[PDB]
Design a protein around this ligand. Structure first.
Ligand SMILES: [Ca+2]
Ligand SMILES: [Ca+2]
Ligand SMILES: [Ca+2]
Ligand SMILES: [Fe+2]
Ligand SMILES: [Fe+2]
Lengths: 387, 72, 168, 510, 388
């Protein structure tokens, strides 16, 4: 029927009259702010905080919890649904963390969707504009397809490293950030494949199959130490905070940043390749986004915790040192990639300057935050000693 | 130094008045008894990108209401 | 001073743990606390409403101490007691895989938790055991889960039946 | 130079090969099953396409909320009883959505096939979206409604009452504590397929009947994400159907999962629908039968038969205990009204006629009791009467099932009245059914949840309320109320004067 | 008050009851498709078509118009509000055109808005990532600031060349496409300034003032003929189709594409400049989007008109020849910029090959569509003469 059979209380005269008759004269409380009891991180409580903080039903025995009592159902053996026992780090309140970008689900998918649709448009322009004509053939069929592609497995491995954290995070604000950090990683891996799939469409003999980049990753030599460092951060670490800290404030901040920013983002442009940088622009935007959250949690919240400042920094300096080694190892192995580059592509003076950029940035953004005394010269030397 | 920085519409608009330049035939193609002053300014400091964003936000709410709640 | 989140009994323990200043004492008081107030095998239920919170407050003290008393290598592979994490792990898993039945398997698992729950054993090793131990415990328990009638199960559990009522 | 691009499916075709073998490539969680490392997923999505399909839905949803709905004052023109009911429905579901994030994060860690991991991952993100969606409903009703209290602080005020404990059992702990596959069954195979999915839609129907157009706008959007979650649960079974251990454990984890979920929703949902509304949509007995027996127990479960899946053995039992379950529970919920974070109302005359018509015998039991409480002044703060007193006076102790946390009163119940009390190592335990009793007997260390009588033992009622912030902005009036009118609201003092002090009912067996 | 004073017919019991009572039992017509009478270009009528076609109140004396009679008020002298007299081109129906991307206002601002927010995100990531460190100083201060900067005026002029067409276009579908082609041009000019403003924030001493780029444009040699061509296209052309056609199917297709793609897009990366290409990607995306519309209007609709095909092609060939010379001159002067580059940046062969790429693409996408006999080597040799 034109009117439908279902009567709605908002528009149906009879039902609506009954509802209006039962309404009070004014609200039964003037406090119309949901989450009003939450401690604002900024001037005024944000939508991000109201909709997120305290969604997790932790009891008071989990630093910050507002509930009481044990969990209703636990694991066989007695392990709690969520507990202090899943991480070495301690704090006065697990809900202190705040994503500087204030991202809850809505803003998050809004930004990635804009990126997705612009990406599509870009690809349609690139192919229609024939810009592929000016791209170096060797760089494409060998460094983009094999080495860049192989790096997708590195990102994919970092992605998966977040699985346990998604399950064990001790708060909502921390779980959301973790989830987004991991989701952005799988995105990057899928973008690497997207480029290879795009090339396959505009380049007659290009094969999008991951066989080549995979073998390079699995049985290769350039990423050997890299993969080892990944399999470890993912499947050998059971502490969710260690996995997130080590992956973002150590490994990916050194290795990852060097490979993406100091190798392809720096060399690709020299081979007439503005395609790959288009996707790395995303990876870098994401890296810098995630970094602000990583810093707020481990430094602003934990590392500077009013009661466990010293304790946590000790644990992190321990983790930093623990993984700084496998990372440097992952780098050295990568260095061997320059040897396969055409003559005159780059010199040792440039790589040394790039490495210091990564190392110096790392020290300025991470190491110095937990009072980790790292020697820039020794690190660069250790890695550079692999050409 | 490496602080997240960007540029907004007003910052670009600051230089928009300078985009036009002089040349003999730079004049209106339409009949008119009047002369619009060469340095007249505008109230809103917009650029194409920002104009699009603010209108897009409005469209979202409008069409959202039309397609969802109002239709239901 | 009665209360759910803040009460005399809780204030009493904070002052008590504060008197601690030795990883040995702290770690020992935690191991003993877990034997006295946690799991269905606790020595008593006198702290039922506050033990979960008090325990954590103890773990904190032990954690801080173990950080200032152990070296980087040990904080990662050594227990607060001095034991070798991995050794304890592989050992407990050995017994578990040998367990003759669910009744035996549950004792091992629960006991493991009471003794090596962080800050005692490193989290990495602990959760690794939790992964292996729990797997075995369930495999034994969930086999023919409904075979044993409630009358017998109650006997097996050793519970003291105080009242039964059933119209159907 | 034809315009060219690449879509999600084209990238997803190679997603399965993203994972590679190596010694420690295995789940970090204890489990009895083995998910095949070559399991596929139904939807070929990548992170970017996922975001776009969800962003489009957000657009419509928030557009309607901020624009038209607000202009129509949709947040206000809702029946008082439903404004209250949504405080519970939205917030309780919120935690279900939130723990589902951790749950799927655990399932993602469990899956070995890249595609199966990707399916779970998609839900991880959906559950985050749903957490924020349920949060938004409370946020919107707090901002624009007739009574913000409760809507604005449920995350903390819900800890005062007993209904919250059982919610955590089915939608928090049941989703993440135990064998990954067990949690999968509680969340997806049973939870969502049997209850959640149908519930969300039903809620939009009751919402619309009572003037609420806010909830349908949000919940119907949540509804569109459910097909991906159904497939996840279904794929979970397909992933272990080959492993021999499955034939040994699948059916018992499922039955335990079934009992767990129905134990709470059977009484609670029927109660929220029939007693938390003015206008009725459909009698809960009819609804329950269709959902649990016809749709789930029949069609849904039936399609999993080829995978060894059997109809829960406790199904017959669930149906016998069901009939009066929600009617029995509301008596307890109302009797303990001061422990909630929402206002309740006794059935009016039209409603009492409706209940009797659909549940022959309702009036002679529940009806007469409510009229007795009302005549005695349970709605008037100067009466000094709270229905909990009537339970004490007439020696009708109220217990909390040690496992499900569901409140039950065997001496008064028109439904199930079984009671099993056990003592073990200096602690008493009370059970309301044979399935929950077995669960505890076999897994005593999985259920040590303290009930409200244990925690509040010896405490005077108003002290517990004040301590857990059960007050409105004026710091004197209670959030909870025994009626939904705008005047004669009970204050902390009205409660204090009752001199009500909690006691552990189990100690009477000593 | 909580309820408010204004009663609404949709929710007010009394008023709604009145409304419901007056309602028919079912719709008074089953044809619920606005624009059903419009001839669909594709399988089914699109939203783009329904909301756009025939919005312009043309009478039948302007090809394709559905109204009748003269305009109600004309210009002093008698000039019609809209009329056939404003363009040399003729057609059977001015409403035949269809933007292949089907852009009406909503989709249009949606995409640009996405591009604006991502741009801001990109710049914040670029600056925070310190990628500016590896950009060659000379390329930045000399070529981006002065020469890329001066190009903003070229794009600004092409934008302005659309002002008369916005007023004279003979149909809704053409006016909307024209408006969007022009708006995309001002956007690019503003993005060039945006980049200069950005560099001014992250590079000490970099002056975002337009003074230098403008002096290069107005008095330099590299862009002299370009500016002369732009001033002509914009102010000496009174025919809205000659303007749109000559801008997009001649000048910008040759000079524009060469500067953006074969010079800056091609060389910037060689100086560690991933910043400029970010914006050029937007410009090229816009160029290709407009091309589809330009091709549909001028080739599919006018150049292939069942009744005026031969005539329109003759006219467009005429316009191509008219504007090809000023365009070659613009490219020829632009050749002077190559001498300004650091030795070894590029060579005559690369330059020549890049020139042929642009010329060959132009012949394929435009010249051949109207049978314009273009001699690719003759055009390139004429341009190479400008190599200092
Ligand atoms: Ca000259
Ligand atoms: Ca050469
Ligand atoms: Ca020739
Ligand atoms: Fe959900
Ligand atoms: Fe779901």
């Amino acid at each position: 029927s034109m009117l439908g059979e279902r009567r709605r209380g908002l528009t149906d005269p009879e039902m609506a009259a009954v509802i209006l008759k039962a309404l009070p004269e004014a609200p039964l409380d003037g406090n119309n702010k949901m989450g009003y009891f939450v401690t604002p991180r900024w001037k005024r409580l944000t939508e991000y905080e109201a909709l997120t903080v305290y969604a997790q039903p932790n009891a008071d025995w989990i630093a910050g919890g507002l509930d009481w009592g044990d969990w209703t159902q636990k694991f066989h053996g007695g392990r709690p649904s969520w507990g202090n026992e899943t991480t070495e780090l301690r704090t006065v309140d697990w809900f202190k963390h705040r994503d500087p970008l204030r991202r809850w689900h809505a803003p998050y998918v809004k930004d990635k969707a804009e990126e997705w649709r612009y990406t599509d448009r870009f690809l349609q322009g690139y192919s229609a504009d024939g810009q592929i004509r000016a791209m170096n053939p060797t760089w494409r069929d060998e460094f983009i397809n094999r080495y860049w592609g192989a790096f997708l497995f590195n990102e994919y491995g970092l992605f998966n490293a977040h699985s346990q954290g998604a399950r064990e995070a001790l708060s909502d604000v921390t779980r959301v950030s973790l989830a987004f950090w991991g989701f952005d990683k799988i995105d990057i891996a899928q973008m690497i494949q997207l480029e290879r799939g795009f090339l396959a469409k505009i380049v007659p003999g290009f094969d999008e199959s991951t066989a080549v980049p995979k073998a390079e990753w699995t049985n290769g030599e350039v990423y050997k130490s890299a993969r080892l460092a990944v399999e470890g951060l993912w499947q050998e670490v059971f502490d969710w905070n260690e996995s997130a800290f080590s992956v973002h404030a150590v490994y990916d901040a050194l290795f990852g940043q060097f490979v993406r920013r100091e190798f392809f983002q720096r060399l690709a442009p020299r081979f007439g390749d503005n395609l790959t940088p288009f996707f790395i622009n995303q990876a870098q935007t994401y890296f810098q986004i995630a970094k602000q959250g990583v810093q707020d949690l481990y430094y602003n919240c934990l590392g500077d915790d009013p009661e466990f400042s010293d304790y946590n920094r000790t644990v992190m300096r321990n983790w930093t040192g623990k993984w700084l080694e496998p990372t440097i190892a992952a780098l050295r192995d990568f260095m061997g990639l320059f040897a396969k580059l055409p003559a005159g592509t780059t010199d040792k003076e440039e790589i040394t300057a790039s490495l210091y950029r990564v190392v110096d940035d790392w020290i300025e953004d991470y190491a110095s935050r937990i009072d980790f005394k790292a020697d820039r010269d020794q690190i660069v030397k250790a890695v550079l000693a692999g050409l | 130094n490496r602080a997240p920085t960007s540029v907004n519409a007003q910052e670009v608009h600051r230089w928009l008045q300078s985009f036009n330049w002089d040349f003999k035939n730079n004049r209106t193609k339409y009949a008119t008894k009047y002369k619009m002053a060469n340095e007249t300014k505008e109230q809103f400091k917009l650029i194409a990108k920002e104009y699009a964003r603010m209108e897009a936000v409005k469209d979202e709410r409008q069409f959202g209401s039309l397609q969802d709640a109002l239709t239901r | 001073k009665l209360g759910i989140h803040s009460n005399d009994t809780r204030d009493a323990w904070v002052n008590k743990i504060a008197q601690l200043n030795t990883l040995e004492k702290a770690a020992e008081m935690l191991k003993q606390f877990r034997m006295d107030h946690t799991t269905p095998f606790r020595n008593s239920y006198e702290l039922d409403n506050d033990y979960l919170w008090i325990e954590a407050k103890l773990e904190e003290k032990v954690a801080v101490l173990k950080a200032r008393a152990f070296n980087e290598v040990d904080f990662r592979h050594k227990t607060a007691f001095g034991e070798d994490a991995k050794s304890v792990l592989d050992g407990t898993v050995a017994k578990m895989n040998a367990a003759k039945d669910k009744w035996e398997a549950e004792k091992i698992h629960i006991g493991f938790r009471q003794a090596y729950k962080p800050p005692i054993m490193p989290v990495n090793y602990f959760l690794d055991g939790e992964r292996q131990l729990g797997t075995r415990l369930m495999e034994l328990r969930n086999l023919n889960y409904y075979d044993t009638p409630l009358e017998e199960l109650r006997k097996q559990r050793g519970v003291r039946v105080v009242h039964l009522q059933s119209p159907h | 130079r034809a315009p060219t691009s690449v879509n999600a499916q084209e990238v997803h075709r190679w997603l399965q090969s993203f994972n590679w073998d190596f010694k420690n490539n295995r789940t970090k969680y204890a489990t009895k099953y083995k998910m095949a490392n070559e399991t596929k997923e139904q939807f070929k999505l990548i992170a970017k396409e996922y975001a776009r399909m969800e962003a489009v839905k957000d657009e419509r949803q928030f557009g309607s909320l901020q624009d038209a709905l607000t202009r129509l004052n949709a947040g206000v023109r809702v029946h008082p009883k439903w404004n209250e009911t949504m405080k519970v429905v939205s917030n309780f579901l919120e935690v279900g959505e939130y723990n589902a994030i951790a749950a799927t994060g655990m399932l993602w860690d469990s899956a070995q096939a890249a595609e199966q991991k990707n399916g779970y991952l998609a839900q991880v993100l959906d559950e985050i979206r749903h957490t924020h969606q349920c949060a938004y409903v409370n946020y919107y009703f707090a901002k624009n409604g007739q009574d913000p209290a409760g809507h604005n602080d449920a995350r903390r005020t819900r800890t005062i009452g007993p209904l919250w404990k059982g919610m955590k059992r089915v939608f928090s702990d049941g989703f993440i504590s135990g064998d990954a596959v067990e949690c999968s069954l509680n969340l997806q195979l049973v939870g969502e397929a049997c209850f959640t999915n149908p519930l969300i839609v039903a809620v939009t129907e009751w919402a619309a009947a009572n003037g609420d157009e806010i909830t349908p706008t949000v919940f119907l959007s949540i509804e569109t994400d459910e097909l991906r979650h159904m497939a996840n649960g279904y794929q979970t079974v397909v992933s272990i159907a080959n492993d021999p251990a499955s034939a040994k454990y699948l059916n018992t984890d499922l039955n335990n999962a079934f009992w767990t979920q129905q134990k709470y929703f059977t009484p609670v949902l029927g109660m929220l629908f029939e007693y938390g509304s003015k206008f009725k949509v459909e009698p809960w007995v009819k609804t329950w039968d269709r959902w649990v027996y016809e749709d789930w127990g029949g069609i849904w479960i039936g399609r999993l038969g080829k995978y060894g899946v059997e109809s829960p053995r406790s199904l017959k039992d669930a149906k016998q205990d069901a009939y009066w379950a929600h009617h029995d529970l509301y008596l307890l919920a109302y009797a303990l009204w001061p422990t909630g974070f929402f206002r309740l109302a006794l059935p009016d005359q039209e409603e009492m006629e409706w209940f009797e018509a659909n549940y022959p015998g309702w009036y002679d039991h529940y009806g007469k009791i409510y009229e007795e409480w009302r005549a005695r002044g349970c709605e008037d703060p100067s009466s000094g009467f709270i229905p909990l007193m009537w339970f004490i006076e007439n020696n009708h102790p109220i217990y909390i099932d040690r496992v499900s946390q569901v409140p039950f009163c065997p001496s008064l119940a028109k439904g199930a009245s079984t009671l099993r009390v056990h003592e073990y190592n200096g602690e008493m335990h009370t059970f309301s059914d044979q399935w929950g009793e077995r669960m505890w007997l076999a897994e005593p260390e999985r259920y040590e949840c303290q009930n409200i009588f244990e925690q509040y033992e010896g405490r005077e009622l108003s002290e517990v309320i004040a301590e857990l912030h059960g007050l409105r902005s004026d710091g004197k009036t209670l959030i909870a109320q025994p009626h939904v009118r705008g005047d004669k609201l009970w204050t902390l003092d009205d409660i204090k004067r009752l001199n009500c002090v909690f006691k552990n009912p189990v100690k009477a067996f000593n």
